[PDB]
């Protein structure tokens, strides 16, 4: 088992992609929150 | 004038007292008064709190009742505790942290008696295993805002680390009162004392359990292991006969042996190993 887990992650490579939810949606959410607060 | 770097220091006992008191009376708003001192005009220390009798059939109590407060203040002094009151506190169950309309008038009395008091609000049912919800507020006057000036002159950037919630903004907040940062003072003695919870005696770690229920448990586990073993290959064979885009959704209503067998393996190994080792050393510890 240990040997198997030692040969586990060799094939994965170049996985720098890390995106959580969005890029410009934070501005829209903040604008909506401010509009709700104003009303 | 006042600045945004004002700090408040709350001990552990005060926190636990107020948390328990707030949790006890969940459906209504209980209240009490704190006590401590102002070592300077940047930090305020609170060291002890006490609850006060309430008038039922409601969710709000007026703080004006001099007999009880005076008696408690003159009786606590007889056993140490020469401190004075610094403010009041009350709990909002499941709402959040803000000051209702009557709360401004309620804190106006303390402001009149002492211009540098504070109001503490604790949420007893929105906190779980950490992240207790406690906020601290002070009032402002609108005449100074008429002058085109804003309170809480800013001298540093350590006062804007936490963004307020939307529900605090919905109510009065910055147009009626300002929040201040909070901190907990910790020392080594009480922290070392407090970690004794759930510790067990030396007897509990040397008992080796009955040798009759253990075999029953192993026999029970082995049969479900067998059934999952039989069901494994059926799911193994059809792993690629269907497009993988719907592969995840295929496992939304029925269990999968692969995930449902590892826990059996783990518990079984742990129990067997520990039961063996306990008897192993016990055979020689005693005679």
């Amino acid at each position: 088992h240990n040997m198997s887990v030692k040969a586990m992650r060799f094939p994965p490579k170049s996985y720098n992609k890390d995106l959580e939810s969005a890029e410009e949606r934070r501005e829209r959410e903040q604008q909506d929150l401010e509009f709700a607060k104003e009303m | 004038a006042v600045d945004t770097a004002e700090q408040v220091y709350i001990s552990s006992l005060a926190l636990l007292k107020m948390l328990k008191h707030g949790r006890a009376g969940v459906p209504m708003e209980v209240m009490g008064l704190m006590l401590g001192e102002f070592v300077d005009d940047y930090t305020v220390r609170v060291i002890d709190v006490f609850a006060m009798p309430q008038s039922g059939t409601g969710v709000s109590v007026e703080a004006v009742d001099p007999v009880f407060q005076a008696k408690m203040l003159d009786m606590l002094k007889q056993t140490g505790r020469p401190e004075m009151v610094v403010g009041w506190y009350h709990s909002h169950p499941g709402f959040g942290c803000w000051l209702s309309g009557v709360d401004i008038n309620t804190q106006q009395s303390f402001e009149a008696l002492s211009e540098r008091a504070v109001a503490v609000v604790v949420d007893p049912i929105q906190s779980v295993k950490g992240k207790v919800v406690i906020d601290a507020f002070r009032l402002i006057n609108a005449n100074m805002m008429v002058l085109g000036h804003e309170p809480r002159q800013t001298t540093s950037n350590l006062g804007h680390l936490n963004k307020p919630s939307i529900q605090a903004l919905i109510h009065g907040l910055n147009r009626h009162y300002y929040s201040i940062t909070i901190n907990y003072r910790k020392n080594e003695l009480e922290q070392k004392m407090l970690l004794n919870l759930h510790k067990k005696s030396w007897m509990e770690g040397l008992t080796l359990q009955d040798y009759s229920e253990h075999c029953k448990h192993n026999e029970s586990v082995v049969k479900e292991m067998l059934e999952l073993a039989k069901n494994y290959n059926k799911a193994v064979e059809e792993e690629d006969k269907m497009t993988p885009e719907q592969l995840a959704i295929k496992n939304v209503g029925k269990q999968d042996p692969k995930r449902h067998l590892e826990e059996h393996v783990d518990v079984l190994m742990t129990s067997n190993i520990v039961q063996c080792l306990a008897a192993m050393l016990d055979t020689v510890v005693f005679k």
Partner: protein, 51 residues
Amino acid sequence: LNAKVRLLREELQLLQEQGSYVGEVVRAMDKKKVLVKVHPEGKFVVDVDKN
């Protein structure tokens, strides 16, 4: 591991937003307009997102 932890915290944050209704569309229109009808209310003529 770090990506997993940060995703968990943000997932905690983003669960306090409003839901979205489901509806039936009857027919479309010109210049990005459609007509829909959701059962616990009348008929609404609405627009379409850019995607």
